PDB file of C-alpha atoms in Angstrom:
ATOM      1  CA  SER V 569       0.351   0.487  -0.311  1.00 49.08           C
ATOM      2  CA  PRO V 570       1.397   3.842  -1.040  1.00 49.19           C
ATOM      3  CA  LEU V 571       0.800   4.488   3.201  1.00 49.53           C
ATOM      4  CA  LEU V 572       2.748   1.564   3.002  1.00 48.95           C
ATOM      5  CA  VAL V 573       6.167   1.900   1.389  1.00 50.17           C
ATOM      6  CA  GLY V 574       5.559   6.163   2.386  1.00 52.53           C
ATOM      7  CA  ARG V 575       5.555   5.388   6.282  1.00 52.01           C
ATOM      8  CA  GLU V 576       8.403   2.645   6.347  1.00 54.54           C
ATOM      9  CA  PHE V 577      10.236   4.387   4.239  1.00 52.74           C
ATOM     10  CA  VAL V 578      10.469   7.594   6.491  1.00 53.01           C
ATOM     11  CA  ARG V 579      10.971   4.948   8.867  1.00 53.30           C
ATOM     12  CA  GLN V 580      13.881   3.690   6.985  1.00 53.33           C
ATOM     13  CA  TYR V 581      15.071   7.458   6.500  1.00 54.12           C
ATOM     14  CA  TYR V 582      15.645   9.447   9.764  1.00 55.68           C
ATOM     15  CA  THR V 583      17.171   5.694  11.099  1.00 55.24           C
ATOM     16  CA  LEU V 584      19.986   6.521   8.625  1.00 55.20           C
ATOM     17  CA  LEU V 585      20.350  10.207   9.125  1.00 55.26           C
ATOM     18  CA  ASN V 586      20.781   9.307  12.411  1.00 52.80           C
ATOM     19  CA  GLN V 587      23.050   6.092  12.042  1.00 53.56           C
ATOM     20  CA  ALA V 588      25.273   6.063   9.071  1.00 52.71           C
ATOM     21  CA  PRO V 589      23.998   9.378   6.346  1.00 55.14           C
ATOM     22  CA  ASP V 590      27.653   7.597   4.753  1.00 55.19           C
ATOM     23  CA  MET V 591      25.048   5.672   2.972  1.00 57.29           C
ATOM     24  CA  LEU V 592      22.155   8.209   2.314  1.00 58.79           C
ATOM     25  CA  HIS V 593      22.982   8.001  -0.890  1.00 60.88           C
ATOM     26  CA  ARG V 594      21.831   4.844  -1.629  1.00 62.64           C
ATOM     27  CA  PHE V 595      18.407   5.506  -1.827  1.00 57.34           C
ATOM     28  CA  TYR V 596      19.382   7.226  -4.753  1.00 56.22           C
ATOM     29  CA  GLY V 597      19.175   6.752  -8.495  1.00 56.79           C
ATOM     30  CA  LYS V 598      20.823   8.762 -11.553  1.00 58.88           C
ATOM     31  CA  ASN V 599      18.046  10.938 -12.353  1.00 58.57           C
ATOM     32  CA  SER V 600      17.419  12.188  -8.203  1.00 59.10           C
ATOM     33  CA  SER V 601      17.001  15.543  -6.967  1.00 57.06           C
ATOM     34  CA  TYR V 602      17.519  16.756  -3.651  1.00 63.35           C
ATOM     35  CA  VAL V 603      16.872  19.877  -2.806  1.00 61.65           C
ATOM     36  CA  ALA V 604      19.557  25.834  -3.077  1.00 62.01           C
ATOM     37  CA  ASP V 605      19.873  24.747  -6.298  1.00 60.80           C
ATOM     38  CA  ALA V 606      18.928  20.728  -6.702  1.00 59.68           C
ATOM     39  CA  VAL V 607      21.744  18.217  -6.814  1.00 61.49           C
ATOM     40  CA  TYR V 608      21.469  15.276  -8.986  1.00 60.54           C
ATOM     41  CA  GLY V 609      22.398  11.230  -8.691  1.00 62.42           C
ATOM     42  CA  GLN V 610      24.344   9.410  -6.499  1.00 64.32           C
ATOM     43  CA  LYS V 611      27.411  11.591  -6.611  1.00 65.01           C
ATOM     44  CA  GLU V 612      26.803  14.758  -5.905  1.00 64.29           C
ATOM     45  CA  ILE V 613      23.993  13.718  -3.430  1.00 67.80           C
ATOM     46  CA  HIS V 614      26.211  11.536  -1.818  1.00 65.82           C
ATOM     47  CA  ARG V 615      28.783  15.383  -1.908  1.00 64.37           C
ATOM     48  CA  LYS V 616      26.005  17.481  -0.695  1.00 65.50           C
ATOM     49  CA  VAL V 617      24.310  14.919   2.499  1.00 65.56           C
ATOM     50  CA  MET V 618      28.160  14.641   3.472  1.00 65.82           C
ATOM     51  CA  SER V 619      28.711  18.058   3.120  1.00 68.87           C
ATOM     52  CA  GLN V 620      25.998  18.831   5.821  1.00 71.76           C
ATOM     53  CA  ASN V 621      27.897  17.075   8.813  1.00 73.08           C
ATOM     54  CA  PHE V 622      25.254  15.367  10.227  1.00 71.56           C
ATOM     55  CA  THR V 623      25.921  13.888  14.156  1.00 71.48           C
ATOM     56  CA  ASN V 624      23.607  12.430  15.941  1.00 73.21           C
ATOM     57  CA  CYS V 625      20.311  13.624  14.402  1.00 73.38           C
ATOM     58  CA  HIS V 626      16.889  13.315  16.564  1.00 74.65           C
ATOM     59  CA  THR V 627      13.448  13.321  13.515  1.00 73.97           C
ATOM     60  CA  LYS V 628       9.976  13.761  16.023  1.00 76.44           C
ATOM     61  CA  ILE V 629       7.741  12.808  13.298  1.00 76.87           C
ATOM     62  CA  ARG V 630       4.584  14.472  13.603  1.00 78.02           C
ATOM     63  CA  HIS V 631       2.374  13.757  10.591  1.00 76.65           C
ATOM     64  CA  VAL V 632       2.873  11.384   7.316  1.00 77.21           C
ATOM     65  CA  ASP V 633       0.672  12.047   3.910  1.00 74.57           C
ATOM     66  CA  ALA V 634       2.279   9.215   1.355  1.00 78.80           C
ATOM     67  CA  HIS V 635      -0.402   8.996  -1.671  1.00 80.44           C
ATOM     68  CA  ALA V 636      -0.283   6.957  -5.521  1.00 83.03           C
ATOM     69  CA  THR V 637       0.989   9.039  -8.164  1.00 79.56           C
ATOM     70  CA  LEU V 638       1.736   9.603 -11.953  1.00 79.49           C
ATOM     71  CA  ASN V 639       3.733   6.176 -12.922  1.00 80.51           C
ATOM     72  CA  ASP V 640       3.365   3.937 -10.238  1.00 83.02           C
ATOM     73  CA  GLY V 641       5.331   5.747  -7.869  1.00 83.82           C
ATOM     74  CA  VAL V 642       3.976   6.962  -4.435  1.00 81.02           C
ATOM     75  CA  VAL V 643       4.452  11.461  -3.296  1.00 82.60           C
ATOM     76  CA  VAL V 644       5.380  11.385   0.539  1.00 83.53           C
ATOM     77  CA  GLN V 645       4.928  15.112   2.787  1.00 81.42           C
ATOM     78  CA  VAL V 646       6.478  14.347   6.241  1.00 83.44           C
ATOM     79  CA  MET V 647       5.891  16.865   8.652  1.00 83.84           C
ATOM     80  CA  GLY V 648       8.036  16.960  11.575  1.00 82.98           C
ATOM     81  CA  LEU V 649      11.386  18.283  14.039  1.00 82.34           C
ATOM     82  CA  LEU V 650      15.211  17.693  12.930  1.00 85.63           C
ATOM     83  CA  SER V 651      17.810  18.035  16.224  1.00 85.93           C
ATOM     84  CA  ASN V 652      21.768  18.604  14.404  1.00 84.36           C
ATOM     85  CA  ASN V 653      25.040  18.234  15.942  1.00 87.13           C
ATOM     86  CA  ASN V 654      22.793  18.001  19.274  1.00 87.39           C
ATOM     87  CA  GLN V 655      21.603  22.009  18.293  1.00 87.43           C
ATOM     88  CA  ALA V 656      17.100  22.692  19.205  1.00 88.64           C
ATOM     89  CA  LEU V 657      14.349  20.847  17.201  1.00 91.59           C
ATOM     90  CA  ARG V 658      13.543  22.270  14.434  1.00 91.54           C
ATOM     91  CA  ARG V 659      10.229  22.040  12.274  1.00 91.65           C
ATOM     92  CA  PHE V 660      10.248  21.166   8.695  1.00 92.27           C
ATOM     93  CA  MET V 661       8.963  19.685   5.995  1.00 93.75           C
ATOM     94  CA  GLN V 662       9.717  16.693   3.543  1.00 95.93           C
ATOM     95  CA  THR V 663       8.157  16.022   0.200  1.00 95.15           C
ATOM     96  CA  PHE V 664       9.288  13.198  -1.302  1.00 94.30           C
ATOM     97  CA  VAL V 665       8.336  11.275  -4.447  1.00 93.69           C
ATOM     98  CA  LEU V 666       9.540   7.878  -4.587  1.00 91.73           C
ATOM     99  CA  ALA V 667       9.661   5.740  -8.421  1.00 91.37           C
ATOM    100  CA  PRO V 668       9.140   1.770  -9.075  1.00 94.81           C
ATOM    101  CA  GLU V 669      13.080   0.485  -8.696  1.00 94.16           C
ATOM    102  CA  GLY V 670      12.244  -1.305 -12.456  1.00 91.23           C
ATOM    103  CA  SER V 671      14.181  -4.476 -12.142  1.00 95.69           C
ATOM    104  CA  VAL V 672      13.021  -5.656  -8.143  1.00 95.42           C
ATOM    105  CA  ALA V 673       9.690  -6.202  -8.082  1.00 95.28           C
ATOM    106  CA  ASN V 674       7.470  -3.604  -5.124  1.00 94.81           C
ATOM    107  CA  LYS V 675      11.301  -1.986  -4.678  1.00 94.92           C
ATOM    108  CA  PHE V 676      11.231   2.401  -5.121  1.00 94.05           C
ATOM    109  CA  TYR V 677      13.879   4.524  -5.184  1.00 90.42           C
ATOM    110  CA  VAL V 678      13.634   8.167  -4.228  1.00 92.99           C
ATOM    111  CA  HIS V 679      12.654  11.146  -7.303  1.00 89.64           C
ATOM    112  CA  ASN V 680      13.033  13.520  -5.037  1.00 88.82           C
ATOM    113  CA  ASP V 681      14.004  14.658  -1.990  1.00 86.86           C
ATOM    114  CA  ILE V 682      12.746  19.051  -1.308  1.00 85.27           C
ATOM    115  CA  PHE V 683      13.272  19.504   2.237  1.00 87.46           C
ATOM    116  CA  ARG V 684      12.157  23.082   3.292  1.00 82.87           C
ATOM    117  CA  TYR V 685      12.974  23.786   7.819  1.00 81.42           C
ATOM    118  CA  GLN V 686       9.992  26.440   8.435  1.00 79.37           C
ATOM    119  CA  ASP V 687      12.171  28.528  10.858  1.00 81.13           C
ATOM    120  CA  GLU V 688      13.662  29.733   7.006  1.00 76.00           C
ATOM    121  CA  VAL V 689      10.632  30.750   5.782  1.00 72.30           C
TER     122      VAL V 689
ATOM    123  CA  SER P 490       4.010  34.482 -34.522  1.00 71.66           C
ATOM    124  CA  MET P 491       6.195  33.110 -31.324  1.00 69.79           C
ATOM    125  CA  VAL P 492       6.946  30.379 -30.424  1.00 68.75           C
ATOM    126  CA  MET P 493       8.747  30.186 -26.678  1.00 71.20           C
ATOM    127  CA  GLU P 494      10.759  27.146 -25.463  1.00 70.57           C
ATOM    128  CA  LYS P 495       8.384  25.170 -22.789  1.00 72.28           C
ATOM    129  CA  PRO P 496       8.236  27.012 -19.246  1.00 70.22           C
ATOM    130  CA  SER P 497      10.313  25.501 -16.654  1.00 69.37           C
ATOM    131  CA  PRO P 498       9.623  22.899 -13.799  1.00 67.57           C
ATOM    132  CA  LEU P 499       9.648  25.792 -11.005  1.00 67.58           C
ATOM    133  CA  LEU P 500       8.054  28.411 -13.461  1.00 69.03           C
ATOM    134  CA  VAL P 501       5.275  25.915 -14.493  1.00 69.16           C
ATOM    135  CA  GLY P 502       5.037  25.544 -10.154  1.00 71.59           C
ATOM    136  CA  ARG P 503       4.952  29.551  -9.316  1.00 69.45           C
ATOM    137  CA  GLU P 504       2.381  30.142 -12.353  1.00 66.19           C
ATOM    138  CA  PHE P 505       0.023  26.496 -11.061  1.00 64.67           C
ATOM    139  CA  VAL P 506      -0.425  28.270  -7.596  1.00 62.40           C
ATOM    140  CA  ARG P 507      -1.051  31.575  -8.515  1.00 62.35           C
ATOM    141  CA  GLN P 508      -3.728  29.856 -10.747  1.00 60.65           C
ATOM    142  CA  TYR P 509      -5.131  28.391  -7.569  1.00 61.88           C
ATOM    143  CA  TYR P 510      -4.517  30.485  -5.138  1.00 59.05           C
ATOM    144  CA  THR P 511      -5.852  33.443  -7.210  1.00 58.77           C
ATOM    145  CA  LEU P 512      -9.236  30.414  -7.598  1.00 58.77           C
ATOM    146  CA  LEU P 513     -10.212  29.947  -4.087  1.00 58.65           C
ATOM    147  CA  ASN P 514     -10.509  32.615  -3.548  1.00 57.06           C
ATOM    148  CA  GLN P 515     -12.601  34.438  -6.754  1.00 56.65           C
ATOM    149  CA  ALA P 516     -14.977  31.197  -7.667  1.00 56.55           C
ATOM    150  CA  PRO P 517     -14.128  27.887  -5.568  1.00 55.96           C
ATOM    151  CA  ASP P 518     -16.927  26.281  -7.058  1.00 58.47           C
ATOM    152  CA  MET P 519     -14.346  25.981  -9.966  1.00 58.73           C
ATOM    153  CA  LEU P 520     -11.488  23.775  -8.257  1.00 58.00           C
ATOM    154  CA  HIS P 521     -12.576  20.775  -8.946  1.00 56.36           C
ATOM    155  CA  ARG P 522     -11.685  21.576 -13.001  1.00 57.66           C
ATOM    156  CA  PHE P 523      -7.741  20.969 -12.163  1.00 57.00           C
ATOM    157  CA  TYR P 524      -9.125  17.723 -10.238  1.00 55.72           C
ATOM    158  CA  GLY P 525      -9.102  13.895 -12.494  1.00 54.16           C
ATOM    159  CA  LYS P 526     -10.986  10.565 -11.909  1.00 53.05           C
ATOM    160  CA  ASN P 527      -7.830   9.104 -10.161  1.00 55.11           C
ATOM    161  CA  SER P 528      -6.724  12.912  -8.557  1.00 58.11           C
ATOM    162  CA  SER P 529      -6.242  12.562  -4.689  1.00 56.73           C
ATOM    163  CA  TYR P 530      -6.839  15.764  -2.334  1.00 58.58           C
ATOM    164  CA  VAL P 531      -6.649  16.406   1.387  1.00 58.17           C
ATOM    165  CA  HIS P 532      -6.999  19.775   2.880  1.00 59.80           C
ATOM    166  CA  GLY P 533      -5.894  19.371   6.618  1.00 61.23           C
ATOM    167  CA  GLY P 534      -9.490  19.050   9.075  1.00 62.77           C
ATOM    168  CA  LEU P 535      -8.621  15.826  12.461  1.00 63.02           C
ATOM    169  CA  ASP P 536     -11.237  12.943  12.900  1.00 60.77           C
ATOM    170  CA  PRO P 537      -5.414  14.446  11.030  1.00 58.51           C
ATOM    171  CA  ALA P 538      -8.309  13.621   8.416  1.00 59.09           C
ATOM    172  CA  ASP P 539      -7.371  11.044   5.550  1.00 60.76           C
ATOM    173  CA  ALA P 540      -7.446  12.505   1.408  1.00 61.01           C
ATOM    174  CA  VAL P 541     -11.093  12.037  -1.049  1.00 62.62           C
ATOM    175  CA  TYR P 542     -10.475  10.991  -4.465  1.00 61.18           C
ATOM    176  CA  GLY P 543     -11.214  11.532  -7.856  1.00 60.24           C
ATOM    177  CA  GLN P 544     -13.442  14.508  -9.533  1.00 60.60           C
ATOM    178  CA  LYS P 545     -16.730  14.592  -7.812  1.00 61.13           C
ATOM    179  CA  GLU P 546     -15.622  14.017  -3.834  1.00 60.09           C
ATOM    180  CA  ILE P 547     -12.789  16.807  -4.293  1.00 57.10           C
ATOM    181  CA  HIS P 548     -15.518  18.970  -5.698  1.00 55.69           C
ATOM    182  CA  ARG P 549     -18.131  18.104  -2.645  1.00 57.21           C
ATOM    183  CA  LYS P 550     -15.121  18.481  -0.345  1.00 58.14           C
ATOM    184  CA  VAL P 551     -13.552  21.778  -0.996  1.00 61.55           C
ATOM    185  CA  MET P 552     -17.921  23.048  -1.214  1.00 64.52           C
ATOM    186  CA  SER P 553     -18.141  21.363   2.465  1.00 63.93           C
ATOM    187  CA  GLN P 554     -14.921  23.259   3.170  1.00 62.23           C
ATOM    188  CA  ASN P 555     -16.988  26.474   2.796  1.00 61.18           C
ATOM    189  CA  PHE P 556     -14.202  28.717   1.218  1.00 62.51           C
ATOM    190  CA  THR P 557     -14.843  32.444   0.843  1.00 60.35           C
ATOM    191  CA  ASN P 558     -13.209  35.888   1.259  1.00 57.49           C
ATOM    192  CA  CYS P 559      -9.808  33.580   1.298  1.00 57.33           C
ATOM    193  CA  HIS P 560      -6.228  35.003   1.851  1.00 54.33           C
ATOM    194  CA  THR P 561      -3.419  33.866   0.827  1.00 54.69           C
ATOM    195  CA  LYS P 562       1.077  34.270   1.844  1.00 52.42           C
ATOM    196  CA  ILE P 563       2.760  32.136  -0.281  1.00 50.41           C
ATOM    197  CA  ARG P 564       6.120  32.420   1.383  1.00 52.15           C
ATOM    198  CA  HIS P 565       7.205  29.608  -0.350  1.00 52.18           C
ATOM    199  CA  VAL P 566       6.978  27.675  -3.819  1.00 54.70           C
ATOM    200  CA  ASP P 567       9.177  25.014  -5.325  1.00 52.84           C
ATOM    201  CA  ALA P 568       9.196  23.138  -8.043  1.00 55.00           C
ATOM    202  CA  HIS P 569      10.896  20.529  -9.776  1.00 57.17           C
ATOM    203  CA  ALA P 570      10.316  17.594 -12.695  1.00 53.95           C
ATOM    204  CA  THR P 571       9.290  14.131 -11.748  1.00 52.97           C
ATOM    205  CA  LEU P 572       8.543  11.203 -12.961  1.00 54.05           C
ATOM    206  CA  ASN P 573       6.825  10.645 -17.097  1.00 52.09           C
ATOM    207  CA  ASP P 574       7.251  15.104 -17.574  1.00 50.48           C
ATOM    208  CA  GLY P 575       5.337  15.430 -14.239  1.00 50.98           C
ATOM    209  CA  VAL P 576       6.519  18.446 -12.059  1.00 50.62           C
ATOM    210  CA  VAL P 577       6.351  18.009  -8.012  1.00 50.08           C
ATOM    211  CA  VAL P 578       5.302  21.285  -6.284  1.00 49.96           C
ATOM    212  CA  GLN P 579       5.900  22.017  -2.310  1.00 48.99           C
ATOM    213  CA  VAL P 580       4.876  25.542  -1.169  1.00 51.02           C
ATOM    214  CA  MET P 581       4.536  26.637   1.928  1.00 51.06           C
ATOM    215  CA  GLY P 582       2.354  29.882   3.110  1.00 50.95           C
ATOM    216  CA  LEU P 583      -0.326  31.173   5.769  1.00 56.19           C
ATOM    217  CA  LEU P 584      -4.362  30.693   4.760  1.00 51.92           C
ATOM    218  CA  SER P 585      -6.967  32.674   6.396  1.00 49.08           C
ATOM    219  CA  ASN P 586     -10.843  31.169   5.660  1.00 49.04           C
ATOM    220  CA  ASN P 587     -13.644  33.697   6.095  1.00 49.46           C
ATOM    221  CA  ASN P 588     -11.872  36.679   7.688  1.00 47.11           C
ATOM    222  CA  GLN P 589     -11.133  33.920   9.875  1.00 44.38           C
ATOM    223  CA  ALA P 590      -6.722  33.203  11.818  1.00 47.05           C
ATOM    224  CA  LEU P 591      -3.987  33.240   9.080  1.00 46.56           C
ATOM    225  CA  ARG P 592      -2.779  29.631   9.891  1.00 49.01           C
ATOM    226  CA  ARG P 593       0.362  27.925   8.398  1.00 48.29           C
ATOM    227  CA  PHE P 594       0.507  25.517   6.407  1.00 49.00           C
ATOM    228  CA  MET P 595       3.110  23.412   4.204  1.00 48.88           C
ATOM    229  CA  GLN P 596       1.185  22.036   0.746  1.00 49.43           C
ATOM    230  CA  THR P 597       2.562  19.217  -1.920  1.00 47.06           C
ATOM    231  CA  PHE P 598       0.928  18.898  -5.511  1.00 49.56           C
ATOM    232  CA  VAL P 599       1.743  16.745  -8.125  1.00 53.39           C
ATOM    233  CA  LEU P 600       1.058  17.947 -11.800  1.00 53.78           C
ATOM    234  CA  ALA P 601       0.526  15.869 -14.851  1.00 53.57           C
ATOM    235  CA  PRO P 602       0.276  16.982 -18.379  1.00 53.75           C
ATOM    236  CA  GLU P 603      -3.048  17.735 -19.408  1.00 55.31           C
ATOM    237  CA  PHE P 604      -1.826  20.683 -16.899  1.00 55.33           C
ATOM    238  CA  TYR P 605      -3.804  19.347 -14.073  1.00 54.63           C
ATOM    239  CA  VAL P 606      -3.788  18.258 -10.224  1.00 55.72           C
ATOM    240  CA  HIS P 607      -2.789  14.165 -10.056  1.00 58.28           C
ATOM    241  CA  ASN P 608      -2.447  15.249  -6.083  1.00 58.79           C
ATOM    242  CA  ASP P 609      -2.444  18.179  -4.010  1.00 57.62           C
ATOM    243  CA  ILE P 610      -1.987  17.704  -0.249  1.00 56.94           C
ATOM    244  CA  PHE P 611      -2.836  20.635   1.611  1.00 56.67           C
ATOM    245  CA  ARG P 612      -2.208  20.198   6.081  1.00 54.94           C
ATOM    246  CA  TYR P 613      -2.317  23.140   8.388  1.00 59.68           C
ATOM    247  CA  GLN P 614       0.844  23.315  10.463  1.00 58.60           C
ATOM    248  CA  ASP P 615      -1.803  24.077  13.906  1.00 56.02           C
ATOM    249  CA  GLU P 616      -3.169  20.357  13.482  1.00 57.19           C
ATOM    250  CA  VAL P 617      -0.672  18.425  13.176  1.00 57.15           C
ATOM    251  CA  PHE P 618       2.491  20.030  15.215  1.00 53.16           C
ATOM    252  CA  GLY P 619       2.418  22.041  19.375  1.00 53.17           C
TER     253      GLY P 619
END
């Protein structure tokens, strides 16, 4: 189901951001966009993730919406709080587009990942 | 006669958002024209409330929300190309309905050619945070 795919991915994503952000790049493909200008593909997305120096990253997910979208994809909207380097929690919204990976059944990859802190808006 | 290069996803998103919120204030009874049979729609609410699917149910949900004299302050719009010529839009702003409180919201759209809205996810921050 789209909500199970969505909520399970969100759990995996923010857990990996805390445990091993150097492995976050495994979610993305050649044409993935990570968003400030967008960076594309695993190599550049990995470099951008590493440049953000994620350390002891704590997350409180307040709500997840996930719906079936174009070409068997899943669109996910996350609302929550994120802390980095033991600084205060900051509210954010995050939009993901999950797309079928195309070579393994029920496997998805992250086609779009758009994050914005609400205090910066 | 002039032919112009197709607009970038960012200005497709920005133009869509300007049109959507102009219509929400001017004629909310016309908002359903953006949606199709497989489109998803959710605009906050607490039982967070569940989404409705398809044009007929979207029109009825929009009419039940009684949008009148809507005021919107769009603080940020992000938009990027997505699957099969689509555009994913992230919107952050403030919305006041019927001269009530200006409420912060977080919204996502998925637009697809013929652009129409495939997904519309809207949530008020005050129904999710605190």
